[PDB]
Structure 1
Amino acid sequence: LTEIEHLVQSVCKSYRETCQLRLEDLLRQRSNIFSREEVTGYQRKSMWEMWERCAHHLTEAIQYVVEFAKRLSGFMELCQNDQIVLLKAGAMEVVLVRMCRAYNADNRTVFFEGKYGGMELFRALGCSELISSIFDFSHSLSALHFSEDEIALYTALVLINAHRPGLQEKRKVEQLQYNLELAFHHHLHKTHRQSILAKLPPKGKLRSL
């Protein structure tokens, strides 16, 4: 048990050190909503200006997820190729999961570049259905009321997936995965939160949306 409970600890600690934006900081800024003047400024930008801003933010978020993977006990031991495949396959899946921390379901806003704004903040993109899916996915995830410890373990499971294609040493990913799934269960039962397992999004929904 001290084995599993130490895995839960190092996973959470690794998440703490790589969460990029602390939860308490995002909640303290909730009342800081973008004004209409500021929304129009975003809407007046060009399609390339908004596409490039979001690409930058996502690329920077992936780096933090790379560090999260680096500090998962056992991930560094996996072969180089398996490290690339797992990251390229699930890094952005973890970023989108992390994005729900920046989402406020009370008013349906998201933290972005200093303040909270709705979907209309991203109109210049021309990706209203994509953005709608991101808001909708975050809204459905917010209804789980994830703790930071639950996001730490859940995101680690999203990353360490033995089924990804291209994995050469599957069985050594299977081991690192089962330990994480069991750690997930131990922490959930010790906090009376096992009822959210049947509510998590399917492995497939994380992507196509």
Structure 2
Amino acid sequence: ASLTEIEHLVQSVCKSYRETCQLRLEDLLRQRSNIFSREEVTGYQRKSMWEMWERCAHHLTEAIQYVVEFAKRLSGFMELCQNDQIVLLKAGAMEVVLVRMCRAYNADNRTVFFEGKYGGMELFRALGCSELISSIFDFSHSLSALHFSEDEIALYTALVLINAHRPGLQEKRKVEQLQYNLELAFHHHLCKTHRQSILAKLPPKGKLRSLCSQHVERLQIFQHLHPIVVQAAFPP
């Protein structure tokens, strides 16, 4: 890989992210002022855990669809066998959703963008998942301190997905090559933008993984009793 090929990979990953980010950073930032009132918060708190589950599972299904679209636009992902494509997305899509969340998170008031406005973790009281929600808000709080640029997120989330250590891969050597090219692209781009300092500040690989596992455990008890059919927007 030459300077030109690496740089093209950076630009491409960043374009694929821009096209699949779901919510524009400009829109999310200008809505930080639009905070849920005490009456609106109480309104969410009065809902059944079943009503909150369906609303949240709908938004989560939608977020996952955008992550899948991002993966499909990454060089070589499409060329991997269907098995390996499923293995990478089964293991990493949720983890990417957790990383993307920091964009919709305001660290000043500890609020998150949810259903048109910003609200604190108390909005989710009915779910009875206060420890898990708190961990989600803590993880988002820690990433927001890094002032992650859109391009840093694109490159970092591409590496969350393109991981050769996922159990069950049939073409491990192809994923390894794709991973290193993206690692080279990420490190090169950090050197061009004087952002070498973020690498040591990134959450340990195990942190996202455990949070994803804790999340999936809770999600399963909910979908076991309440499945839902949500509309899918895309592909080309």
Where on the TM-score scale, by shorter chain, does this alignment land: which range?
over 0.9
Separation of aligned partners in 2, 1:69 and 1:191: 24
Cα deviations by residue, 1:122-143 (Å, 9 ceiling, x for unpaired):
0010000000000000000111
Separation of aligned partners in 2, 1:208 and 1:174: 23
Give, in angstroms, the shift of residue 27 of structure 1. Answer: 0.3
Give, in angstroms, the shift of residue 90 of structure 1. Answer: 0.1
Separation of aligned partners in 2, 1:191 and 1:20: 25
Separation of aligned partners in 1, 2:55 and 2:91: 23
Residue in 2 that maps onto 1:115: 117
Q: CA RMSD in A?
A: 0.6
Separation of aligned partners in 2, 1:91 and 1:161: 12
Q: Secondary structure at the match of 2:10?
A: helix
Cα deviations by residue, 1:98-144 (Å, 9 ceiling, x for unpaired):
00000000111100000000010000100000000000000001111
Give, in angstroms, the shift of residue 92 of structure 1. Answer: 0.5
Q: Secondary structure at the match of 1:207?
A: helix
Q: Which runs of 5+ in 2 are unaligned?
A: 212-236
Number of aligned positions between the proteins = 209
TM-score w.r.t. structure 1 length?
A: 0.99
Cα deviations by residue, 1:133-175 (Å, 9 ceiling, x for unpaired):
0000000011111000000000000000000000111000001
Q: Secondary structure at the match of 2:94?
A: helix
Cα deviations by residue, 1:7-41 (Å, 9 ceiling, x for unpaired):
00000000000000000100000000000111011
Residue in 1 that maps onto 2:130: 128
Separation of aligned partners in 1, 2:173 and 2:52: 42
Give, in angstroms, the shift of residue 207 of structure 1. Answer: 2.5
Separation of aligned partners in 2, 1:160 and 1:54: 27
Q: Which runs of 5+ in 1 are unaligned?
A: none
Q: Secondary structure at the match of 1:72?
A: coil
Residue in 2 that maps onto 1:82: 84
Q: Secondary structure at the match of 2:22?
A: coil
Give, in angstroms, the shift of residue 94 of structure 1. Answer: 0.2
Separation of aligned partners in 2, 1:97 and 1:136: 12
Residue in 2 that maps onto 1:12: 14
Residue in 2 that maps onto 1:68: 70
Percent identity, aligned pairs only, is 100
Separation of aligned partners in 1, 2:98 and 2:84: 22
Cα deviations by residue, 1:71-109 (Å, 9 ceiling, x for unpaired):
001100001100001000000000010000000001111
Give, in angstroms, the shift of residue 51 of structure 1. Answer: 1.2
Give, in angstroms, the shift of residue 46 of structure 1. Answer: 0.2
Separation of aligned partners in 2, 1:120 and 1:136: 14
Separation of aligned partners in 2, 1:200 and 1:167: 26
